[PDB]
Amino acid sequence: CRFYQHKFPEVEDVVMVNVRSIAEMGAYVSLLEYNNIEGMILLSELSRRRIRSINKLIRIGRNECVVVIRVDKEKGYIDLSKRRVSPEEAIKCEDKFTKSKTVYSILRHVAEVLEYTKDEQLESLFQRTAWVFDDKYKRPGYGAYDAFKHAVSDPSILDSLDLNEDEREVLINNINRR
Amino acid sequence: EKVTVHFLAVWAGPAQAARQGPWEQLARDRSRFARRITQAQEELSPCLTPAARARAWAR
Amino acid sequence: TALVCDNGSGLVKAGFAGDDAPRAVFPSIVGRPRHQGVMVGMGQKDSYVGDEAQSKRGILTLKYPIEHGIITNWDDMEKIWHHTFYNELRVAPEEHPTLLTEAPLNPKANREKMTQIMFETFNVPAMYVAIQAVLSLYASGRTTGIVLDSGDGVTHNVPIYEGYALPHAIMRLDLAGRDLTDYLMKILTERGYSFVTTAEREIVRDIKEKLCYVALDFENEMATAASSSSLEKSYELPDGQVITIGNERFRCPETLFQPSFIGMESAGIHETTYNSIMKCDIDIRKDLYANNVMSGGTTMYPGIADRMQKEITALAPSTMKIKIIAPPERKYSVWIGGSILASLSTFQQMWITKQEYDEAGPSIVHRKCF
Amino acid sequence: LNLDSIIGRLLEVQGSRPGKNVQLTENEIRGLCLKSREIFLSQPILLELEAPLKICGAIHGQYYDLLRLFEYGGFPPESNYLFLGDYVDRGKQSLETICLLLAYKIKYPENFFLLRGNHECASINRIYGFYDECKRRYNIKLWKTFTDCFNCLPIAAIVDEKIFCCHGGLSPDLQSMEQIRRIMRPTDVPDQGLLCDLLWSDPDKDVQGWGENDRGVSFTFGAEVVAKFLHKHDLDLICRAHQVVEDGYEFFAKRQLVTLFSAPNYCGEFDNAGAMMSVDETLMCSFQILKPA
Amino acid sequence: IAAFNIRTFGETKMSNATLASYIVRIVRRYDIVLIQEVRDSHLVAVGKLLDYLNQDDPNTYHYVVSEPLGRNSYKERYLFLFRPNKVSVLDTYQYDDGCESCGNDSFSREPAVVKFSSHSTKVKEFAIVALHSAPSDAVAEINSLYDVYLDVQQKWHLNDVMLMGDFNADCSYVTSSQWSSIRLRTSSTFQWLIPDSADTTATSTNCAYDRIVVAGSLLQSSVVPGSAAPFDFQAAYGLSNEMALAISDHYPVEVTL
Ligand SMILES: Nc1ncnc2c1ncn2[C@@H]1O[C@H](COP(=O)(O)OP(=O)(O)OP(=O)(O)O)[C@@H](O)[C@H]1O
Ligand SMILES: *[C@@H]1O[C@H](CO)[C@@H](O[C@@H]2O[C@H](CO)[C@@H](O)[C@H](O)[C@H]2NC(C)=O)[C@H](O)[C@H]1NC(C)=O
Ligand SMILES: [Mn+2]
């Protein structure tokens, strides 16, 4: 399941990608935050062939953060740009990716106990937990993470969630194992 | 350093409109559809052969 | 190179094989002047088609020569195609193979005239006729499944197995796009608004397309409509006036599920889908249940995916794996599927060629196109 | 072939609000194409030119800037022009640009000269816009006519044995000028060899000798490589056009080389200047610069 | 020939069965009538008007109607109604007033120009120029009419041109001192048949708003002196002041050939 309520990124966000293949017209990439849907990164700058484009392909083991240049929700395309990300902008992306991944990892163990098999079932769990904090605090990503850390000291944060006693214990357990 | 400076400002109209072209955003939106045929071809063709094309209306 | 011309009741979708979207989308309308006259700076026109025909409808008698999916007037239809090739795509038909699309269960006599016109009147080098529902399935990238193709004029359920329609299971519901628009116009009128000028009558369709949705729980929201503070939304008219729309947002597409609202005794789309599966061989139902693909513009309403999921699970055997696929591209899925089919290398020997027609005659269409 | 009516219609729209299209007939542009490819084949592959002239760099389809560019240095024949290529990709009106240049080539074949850029290559302008641009506004059969003229374009020029001009740069295989004259046309751009190298290499301030080129299909060369070639033939500093530089021009070897890029506000993504070099009758060099908006 | 500005001539006004009756009676008096200020986006009113007139015989009236003209959202058409048994249309064209996007077009509502064939009269070829002036641009637009005459000469080799329509001409719109700026009046080529003293307003004001202006030797000698006058349809049809305004705020201007 994706990390956030919305199914597509907003124009101008910088997102992290995995480089999947090299073709004539660019690199196909997977958005790590959006359930691995496929995007693209336009040709970085100037001009280039495919022969030495593999020296530009070290991102496959680097997972660069790139900015969304165009979206078309109807057609399904996401175009991205590497060239416009500054090093200072990049530092936040590494931090954001680690933070958002942490919420996922907490919830992924949650997903195992109830044995979800369909993405929409997993999303609804998210809708009632991680995404409640994201919406309540109008801070995508950061909201869920900050609240989970607090649960060590403030257990009451799960009380307003629609959960039974059993559901609560396994969620609480996985925080302690951190 | 013989620069004849031309600090030439807008004298036509929408200066930023006639520089950034839709072609790089229409050829890119072509390949990602051009590649969809090949992935489809490896799933769509086995129903488009003369031996099987006569199978359907038989049953 | 190849052309794809999807002839629809409401909208014609035309373009080139290989392109991801149709070049031209315009109303399937041909208009002939009721009176004698000219537009300033023009010679006398005998007909207008499409966009120009819509905007001048006042002085014309409009014809929608595609009624409930079936081509029913060949004089009018000749003029829609003439407009498509020469004015909209700006191509010469003799250079380009042209794939046409046909409605499901099109009568045999109708099929033949389509082939005849293309060759003798337009001299196309090749042509093919594909069932629209089948093209829709291809574009989603699977070969087995049941298509819900619901458009402007007609809705069809078409179960498809191994690439070919199953004639024993096609159901026809005469409830589709323009019935919903008309129903909305009625109930919006009942609220105490007036759509008098043509300018004001055409916009009702726009309101439908943008703000309407299918309710997840019907019973709850019908009581909650007036009370709720968040349901009701406002749409600004072009003059400046702002009207408020309430329970009409979700009552309108409900018509799809309960045709009785407008006096049709047919069964709803959830029921017809079920009836379609049970008319097929017991051997295949597992695969149908798992591949309900929805198609066409009137299936575009937000929320319809989740509502279909629920209503079908209730009717089917308890353990059947059900999945509804609602491709984001589904307002052009018919055309796009046509674009894919005509681009395959394998498909190049399935075309009806000019040679073949000269030997066999119009009856070839049944041998080659099915 | 009435060149002036076609050219007249193209130029009448100068000064209008940008975006306005010019729609020639298919037969006319085919007419432009059919009368264009004859003069190039009749002239040498290594041109021998005379001053005075105006020199200008890459255009990349910024047609309204091309029309603005001629407003300052003088229309032919009050001053001669050579453009160095890269006018067929990314911008919005590549077609008008190339169609206008060939028409002027036919009118003034001894006063107007065009070299081949790396974008004058089927595999490139397939990717970066020009193939797609012909399909929307015209058709692909006419595109094939275009892939016939490019194969006969020249690639470099030397002014009075003192200023060496070309699109890309030097090659470790270029020992005699005869090696260039022997390359046969029409030709595609091969996957290796001299013709490729002349169109793609770039200078770099921090390499000594030969380095690896980010472009792939070619190479980089350092500061010491530059000095030896000029020295062997008793030549001076070199002026070429293929890069993007913020100032419109940028020196990189203690003023021994300048790069020209002539399209300001490049494709709406940059705030760079575009520069033109103005060379008078005595070979004195000056610069013409379009400052950012 | 008439020039009739029908205030907010649209669907609303034509659906009223009463108003339709009276409008049709007015048109039927005339063999050619120009209707101005047609605010009819999709030509529904125009269709409904021709249907009423052409119920019994389909060729009583033919039409010449324009595209919506304008710099802004407000756009009007020129609607020509003519009897095809009396005159024929050989050619029409929209005056090219230049490039709107440049901001150089001389008129907000470009005059429609129609070449007529008239077999029954002494004059064989003549032009009708249509003008609905912009209220707030009357001064500039009337001046621009000088240039329109010269254009007509080039295309058709025709000196005989009749200019008619809603000029918006009056005391406030053209004051005494401004009259000396209008070449069309100071030049003896043009006879002004509607004088300053005529009253063409249905209100109690005394304003010569509507005018007909004629150029050319041949056409001038065909005009019957003094026939140009307002037709008070209120008087002739005995109406109240309220219904008169509901129809239109302008009277027709008529002429007999
Ligand atoms: N977002 C939307 N919401 C509701 N209705 C819509 C939306 N978009 C389009 N429609 C309606 O869909 C119809 C057009 O759909 P489509 O083009 O699939 O029909 P068609 O293909 O022309 O006809 P057919 O499907 O019978 O061949 C029109 O009635 C249009 O009003
Ligand atoms: C057509 O319009 C006229 C005026 O707009 C209508 O006459 C008026 O009708 C209303 C009815 O709502 C009365 O209240 C007024 O007193 C009438 N005013 C005058 C001055 O007559 C006429 O009724 C309309 N006809 C139709 C068929 O709609
Ligand atoms: Mn280059």
Numbering used by the authors:
A (entry chain E): 5 to 182
B (entry chain C): 560 to 618
C (entry chain A): 6 to 375
D (entry chain B): 7 to 299
E (entry chain D): 3 to 259
Report text from the authors:
Dephosphorylation of eIF2αP terminates signaling in the ISR. In mammals, dephosphorylation is assisted by one of two known regulatory subunits, PPP1R15A or PPP1R15B. PPP1R15A, also known as GADD34, is encoded by an ISR-inducible gene and serves in negative feedback, whereas PPP1R15B, also known as CReP, is constitutively expressed. Addition of G-actin strongly stimulates eIF2αP dephosphorylation by PP1c–PPP1R15.
